[PDB]
Design a binder for this molecule. Sequence first.
Ligand SMILES: CCCCCCCCCCCCC/C=C/[C@@H](O)[C@H](CO[C@@H]1O[C@H](CO)[C@H](O)[C@H](OS(=O)(=O)O)[C@H]1O)NC(=O)CCCCCCCCCCC
Ligand SMILES: CCCCCCCCCCCCC/C=C/[C@@H](O)[C@H](CO[C@@H]1O[C@H](CO)[C@H](O)[C@H](OS(=O)(=O)O)[C@H]1O)NC(=O)CCCCCCCCCCC
Ligand SMILES: CCCCCCCCCCCCCCC
Ligand SMILES: CCCCCCCCCCCCCCC
Ligand code: NA
Ligand code: NA
Lengths: 203, 203
Amino acid sequence: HLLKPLPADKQIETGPFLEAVSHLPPFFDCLGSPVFTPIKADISGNITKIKAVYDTNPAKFRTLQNILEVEKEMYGAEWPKVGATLALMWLKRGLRFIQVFLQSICDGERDENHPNLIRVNATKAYEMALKKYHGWIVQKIFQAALYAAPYKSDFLKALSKGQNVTEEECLEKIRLFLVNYTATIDVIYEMYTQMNAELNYKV
Amino acid sequence: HLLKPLPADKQIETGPFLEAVSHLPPFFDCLGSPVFTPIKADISGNITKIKAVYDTNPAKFRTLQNILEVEKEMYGAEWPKVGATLALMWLKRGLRFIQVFLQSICDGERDENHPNLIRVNATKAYEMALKKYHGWIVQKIFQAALYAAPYKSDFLKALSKGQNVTEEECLEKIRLFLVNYTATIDVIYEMYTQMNAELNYKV
Ligand SMILES: CCCCCCCCCCCCC/C=C/[C@@H](O)[C@H](CO[C@@H]1O[C@H](CO)[C@H](O)[C@H](OS(=O)(=O)O)[C@H]1O)NC(=O)CCCCCCCCCCC
Ligand SMILES: CCCCCCCCCCCCC/C=C/[C@@H](O)[C@H](CO[C@@H]1O[C@H](CO)[C@H](O)[C@H](OS(=O)(=O)O)[C@H]1O)NC(=O)CCCCCCCCCCC
Ligand SMILES: CCCCCCCCCCCCCCC
Ligand SMILES: CCCCCCCCCCCCCCC
Ligand code: NA
Ligand code: NA
């Protein structure tokens, strides 16, 4: 479930984007703990919200840019803290977490003392994508939750279950996925900047 | 939204029980933090599951005892870790948490160093109702989450907002609620014992 390549105009079609990222919450099951259940629910809830908006008028909401532009017009001063704009503001952070996490694993980043954990990789991704938006209590909850993360080898095997591929092949496929995925996330973040749609409030 | 008194036969009608406890998740908002959102979702999800079972045949599922008896018959060896029996096994723990927490506040239990927090009351309730069913990682997550709890005075005011009553009056109304609520929870727990429907697994 690769993302589509970016067109020259860098516009991201909403329908296909939603279809693609809808495949990402299931992989949370690959972490193997109920600790990750509310996480999968938050990301799913963002996707549901954006889809619900889109479905009201797919042509009006053809692209993610259209969502922001249209909602900016539709709403008052509560924008961008409303609607699919808010849902995508949070979704992009989760998407970026996943991106940074996977990229870190693929790049061979590891605690040389504990080379088969994924805590360093998840911590980096958390720092880069989400931490700034969490108050100290939520940050404490993340640090605790990371102990529930699987072994690296197990996580990777879970990502390729049934395919009977080597770890090296699994990582090559992740790297392939990361190309259009990273590009797409980067464009989304830049659009939030350009539209002055980004907020910095903590939860 | 008082619970009904217990009849001589101690049978608890499912429909009215569900209607009554459906009023309890909203009061989570009285804690004033997003930290409690996944908690309210778990308890709501149990109530939804039990209601969904009940709705298949309200007469068959007339009482909570009926639910356990019928599901024991309907299911194989997966019972009691299935169905509305499992949902109620977890719901009762949340209900008991609430009971112990409220009763502790009403009984004047406090950290004399910090008399306007509710951490001691919530810790006691957690220890008595849920802790045993949590692995160490989830227990760490609870301890962290408790820091998000409101001041006692604020929590109580939030429970009576609009009514313009004193704290003393608010607590008298809580104490009234606790009579049939405690009795009902105690019967539920005893039924799980009698039916050998209780499990001790940790999450
Ligand atoms: C039982 C004993 C007691 C203990 C219970 C305490 C439990 C406390 C758990 C707290 C955290 C649950 C995770 C969810 C966090 C969320 O609060 C945030 C903000 O969530 C956003 O809020 C907005 C309003 O401000 C809108 O409602 C958004 O919704 S809208 O659709 O309405 O616009 C919504 O996503 N999302 C987040 O921070 C994003 C989560 C992304 C995670 C990325 C993967 C990381 C994996 C990490 C590895 C560990
Ligand atoms: C974003 C950065 C990363 C950080 C994110 C990490 C977040 C981790 C949060 C973890 C905890 C969320 C709370 C939910 C816990 C639940 O896991 C448990 C068991 O839940 C049960 O599981 C069963 C299967 O075994 C069935 O599915 C039940 O469902 S069924 O309906 O299918 O049968 C379900 O209730 N319920 C519980 O432990 C019960 C909760 C009761 C709480 C009572 C009020 C206490 C208030 C406490 C004050 C603090
Ligand atoms: C601390 C664990 C958080 C890990 C979050 C990753 C779960 C999603 C996995 C996405 C895999 C998509 C790969 C497709 C090639
Ligand atoms: C650490 C905070 C957990 C508190 C859980 C209590 C929330 C539910 C309040 C129930 C109030 C019902 C009173 C009716 C009279
Ligand atoms: Na690179
Ligand atoms: Na007493």
